Design a protein around this ligand. Structure first.
Ligand code: ATP
Ligand code: ATP
Ligand code: ATP
Ligand code: ATP
Ligand code: ATP
Lengths: 319, 326, 326, 320, 317
């Protein structure tokens, strides 16, 4: 009828490296969905979603985990920056909108081998029933004049979280049962700085960790459709056969990490950055470089990258 | 014909623990509705609702009591943040919209193949009836009104009050169903009022809110009860939830007593979020089982003080201190 | 053909206690309406309303008098805070809208299952008749105009005045029923004017508000009367309400004298909200009975000074002092 | 074909007392309209209105004169506070909206014999474009004297209109090119020479209006078609009372309005509507059951009904 | 096929007095239009307008020249205050709207169809539209300033060429000719954002209008003032005649004041005239048949002295 706690984490482990607690959290969450809606009418409607608040550094998974959860649950998903509102009902609106495309797409599948009404109500059903809403950087609309402008968005989100109704161009949808997942670094504010009303509709606090050299090494190759898995597949098209050696990855990764530490740690994005910086030349020539096989090793990588440029501060600003 | 003061309170006691004065308040209130509208035309329209202002701490019942009142009276209800307006007529608009659902759904079944049901309705009547619904027994719950009180940029708030007058005071607002009159809508306003006194609202309003009723902080002991008594209490819920995965669960008195003492415990030590703290502590305790409960079929978990005492781990506190003191 | 100066006052005396000059003012005013519109075309349109400005304390009648004047004249009425605009044409718009429900439910309950109703109507005429109603006998009450007076960010207010001129002064505004003209609407503006003088409004307006009339603070002795004289007074109402539950209630003179001396009492000690304070204290008194009156059938409660004195309790006041005093 | 400079003034003299130069200004102005539109195509469109800026005190005629001019010329008219904009195109919109009610108003008598909306509109549009009068009140306020560029902005905003542009109305496209504009203002702080040059020159005709005098009130009090006195008489008539104001009574009533205007907030001629309603107090109530009788309002009466004044409150309280 | 550089100046000379460099500039400009659009597809679209920035004092022709240029070219034309935006796409929108009328007014007399029209109108805009941005010097630089140096960034796309949606379809500012004007008494044109500063290649200056100049704008232009009053008083039956020395006087006068006070340029003639033709304009009605001989005496009278003297004193110690 549906996946299970441990069952879903597996699926998640397929695309995200590490960040366990988090995976579990959304798992037990997604699972409670099947549990309720399996209860009898009185409770089937009385029990409510156990919203999660993921705390963590930049780009280490919060979002993927969320987007994936939705994905493996074939659930209407939608992400929104909290600061985007410094019309909130739009969130639920957009969600429902997504809900159609979803239901619709999987309708022309059986209706190929219709009616408007059934669709809309069946999309609503989906929103109201299994919608995931991801509120990014909610830690930004926390507290720390012009502040009540932010501490306001919270009061503005309550009705959604807390359960209300918003009108969409497909009908009336109820936020009552939408699963919410709020994210944030919280380097300055504690989550215990949100308005109590919200602080309590965000029961599950889960933590995500900084990503390591060693970790990068993995995100670099394990994940279904990793970066290396991608370039290989991409240069392939041009006819070029490429191969990354262990030490090469180790190097690539030790490099991503290297800069993150020396400058603006942008988390795992730094891999997409270092990769494109490495796969630079080949990406161009790959075209008329048919047949060849590039053997990207530690030497290769160590060259393609060059020299880290740090210590710009000091001098210029110091006495 | 309709329930009664004491009668209604009973029904409320089913879902809210404590907060008596409050229950009564809304009870006498919902009762006066049946009393007028039982009077003769001159007065039937001359007498007006006795709106309520519930003063209290966070999540101790203010809203449930209202939401329930509405529910047990099958009345068009609607809640709105007071600060939401820092278009107010919307409140009445949304209300009417809800009365529709109520009045509609009230004739799609109780008064009676999916293509069956169309010209036997008369979509020219429903609305009218939906209006009456609103016009006659609408309950509006204005939350944290204490926030649009006083204490530049303040007149922006002391404004929402003047904006609400017309509703409370009695006016007409156009809805996509026609004209509805707030003249008889029952209004229930709520607020903590830790900074402002209710006697800080604009007099025009301060007198349209005649009934002042207080609600209490929720106690350890109180938690113990909200914990199990209420129709569909938390435990009553988890039990029902783990049931589905095949696990049979049971909470021992001492466990509840512990769970509660625990929620309370933290509330006092940090940000007292009222009863929400139970939903919080429960999800923290039911952690483990909630995962494994799936492949943990058949077994029966016996949640006792020991269990809880563990699942919750130790308390943290007074982070502050040091770092800010000399 | 219509009532008369002294004849209208009588009707007003039925619901308002005291506040005479005011009653007169709106009387002669309502009368002039019949006077013109009785004149020949040249003047029938040249002569304009003599708009009134009621200056008074809080809740002493300013609005009842207006709302009632309107009611006894079966005239489209509408009230608006002046500060509501710190779209003004909406005033006339909403007015026109009210003229519908008035005229509508006036050629349905007069000029007359719900199928023989589409007869006569002639929608394009109903409208053309409401527009007259507005244009001819509309009363617009502009509350707390003294607030949009003057005393930066002040021109925001001294602006709503310039914004109201065209209405007062006479112009046209488009309604969803057609074009209506403010030329003849009767305007009644009210305000306490504790800080600003009326002679602080913009001259343009200062002159279109010819009639100044003063209302008096409501006294203990006064309360005693608003408490029982007025058609459908408070006591008259409660009596009528407990009746329904089957309880027979009776207020002794000394009881009223007490209830009133009570309302006044607090009004003086705190935020004087005028007569609203009676609706307050009454509810605070009829507390118990209102609950139990249900299963308290047959009995008869005798509310005397003892009673009231009890049901109310003591008054709080010197909250101030201390804390902010050295 | 149309009235004349001296001919129109006559008509105006019928409702406004005094304020001559002004009447003339709008007269020559409404006349130039008939003059052009009588010329041949090249010029018929090349010559433009000679817009007026009336400078004056509060309520001494500026608007009546304008409202009336419009009226006597049966032209689409519209008045607007200049400060209302601190959507300007609305002016032309509302104007055109009026034209419609004005054309169609007279297109139901012509079509009484025994329509065609695609023409009607096309007509009101000609109406507006051809003889529209726009009255911009208190423009002296949007003059200059930060937050000031907010006002000196409305001017730049009005140019296109005054200067001649096109604005879309729900009846079609209309051209302000030929609309007649009359701007008014007290100008007690700013000189008209304070407006933006662009506008300072599209307001050629400067005409000044005078404060209203005791003597003047005496006249606004009885001469004007439908004067106040003429009105009350007409009003108490209905209740059956015959009333009569004696010369000296008028002289007194007026000396009185003036009196106060000088002593307090001079609101111009409105002060008469004020004093009249203050005097006609009593009678207005009792006139109802006072049938038959005849009240003889003389100097004594008025002197009574009015009482005494309050002329010197300040001092004290504020002075050391 | 179309007029020419020198050929257009002529036509302009007919309504504007002086301001030659200006006339030439729009001349070569309107001419370039015919030149391109005479080229072969690759270039017919590659070459773009050479936008003009006219710098000058108040009311000395900046706008007439432009409005006329447009007129004589039967082109969709539109003027806008630059500060009007302190929705910019409207300019192009309103322009299109205008071409619609210009394209109606022709297609109606031709016959003596929707699709064809809206499209046909659109080519008009896209192909020969003139947009006159006034007092752009105001949205130049000199906090709350980035609010102006913003309108520039807002105009770029138009000038620079983009597309905007009109209720008639999609139009492209790619080829619209833009003419911007401004006094520039405080800011230099070299103070606008570079992006724009390079899209306004042609800089042309207009001069202050002189006494002597006035004398001419006073009588030479088709439908000059005098020509106008004559024509107007004619209607009332009065025959009027201005004498040379009279015009010399009227003008000398206009100029006189401009110098002594708020120099509003040529408008000062519309001013002084109305001030002079005062009396006549009223009486002219029942003054039929007569003939008025407006000489220097007459003018010198009807105006009646006015030297500056206000300032100082009250403000000086
Ligand atoms: N542990 C990880 N496993 C797999 N992919 C990862 C991991 N961490 C980061 N990524 C990749 O890096 C990107 C991180 O996106 P994500 O938004 O989840 O970070 P975040 O912590 O949610 O950041 P923010 O809240 O600042 O947006 C994704 O493309 C993801 O595929
Ligand atoms: N005494 C109580 N008995 C039963 N349930 C309660 C009680 N107090 C709180 N709750 C539960 O805790 C939550 C309290 O939310 P609620 O909004 O009712 O509190 P509130 O005081 O009205 O809130 P706010 O602070 O937003 O006004 C609800 O889920 C309710 O079921
Ligand atoms: N003298 C009176 N006689 C009868 N009812 C009165 C009297 N004074 C007040 N009331 C009652 O008390 C309330 C007074 O409110 P009302 O709005 O009429 O006063 P107000 O002068 O308009 O106040 P505000 O200036 O604050 O609007 C009404 O409900 C009215 O029924
Ligand atoms: N000289 C006059 N003759 C006749 N009636 C007059 C005269 N002056 C004023 N009135 C009357 O008094 C009022 C004068 O107001 P008016 O419309 O003239 O304003 P205004 O003088 O233009 O002032 P502002 O522009 O400051 O509003 C009108 O009702 C008009 O009927
Ligand atoms: N050189 C001139 N020859 C003829 N007429 C002129 C001349 N200069 C100005 N005028 C007349 O004076 C008016 C000037 O308007 P114009 O729009 O040309 O001024 P501008 O210099 O563009 O002003 P702005 O400061 O608004 O840009 C027009 O009516 C025009 O006929």
């Amino acid at each position: 009828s549906e996946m299970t706690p441990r069952e879903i984490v597996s699926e998640l482990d397929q695309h995200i490296i590490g960040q366990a607690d988090a995976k579990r959290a959304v798992a037990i969450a997604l699972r409670n969905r099947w549990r309720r809606m399996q209860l009898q009418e009185p409770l089937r409607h009385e029990v409510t979603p156990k919203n999660i608040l993921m705390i963590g550094p930049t780009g280490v998974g919060k979002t993927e985990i969320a987007r994936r959860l939705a994905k493996l649950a074939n659930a209407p998903f939608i992400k929104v920056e909290a600061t985007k509102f410094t019309e909130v009902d739009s969130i639920i609106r957009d969600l429902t909108d997504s809900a159609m495309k979803l239901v619709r797409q999987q309708e022309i599948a059986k209706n190929r081998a219709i009616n408007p009404e059934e669709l809309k109500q069946k999309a609503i059903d989906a929103v109201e029933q299994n919608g995931i809403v991801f509120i990014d950087e909610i830690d930004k609309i926390c507290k720390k004049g012009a502040d009540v402008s932010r501490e306001g968005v919270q009061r503005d989100l309550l009705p959604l979280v807390e359960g209300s109704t918003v009108s969409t161009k497909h009908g009336m949808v109820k936020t009552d049962h939408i699963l919410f997942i709020a994210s944030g670094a919280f380097q300055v504010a504690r989550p215990s700085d949100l308005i109590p009303e919200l602080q309590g509709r965000l029961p599950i606090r889960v933590e995500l960790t900084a990503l390591s050299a060693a970790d990068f090494e993995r995100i670099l190759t394990e994940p279904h459709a990793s970066l290396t898995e991608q370039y290989k597949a991409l240069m392939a098209t041009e006819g070029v056969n490429i191969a990354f050696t262990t030490d090469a990855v180790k190097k690539i990764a030790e490099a991503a990490f290297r800069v993150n530490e020396k400058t603006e740690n942008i988390g795992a994005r730094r891999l997409h950055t270092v990769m494109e910086r490495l796969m630079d030349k080949i990406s161009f020539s790959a075209s008329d470089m048919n047949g060849q096989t590039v053997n990207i090793d530690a030497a290769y990588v160590a060259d393609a990258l060059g020299e880290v440029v740090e210590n710009e501060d000091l001098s210029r600003f110091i006495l």
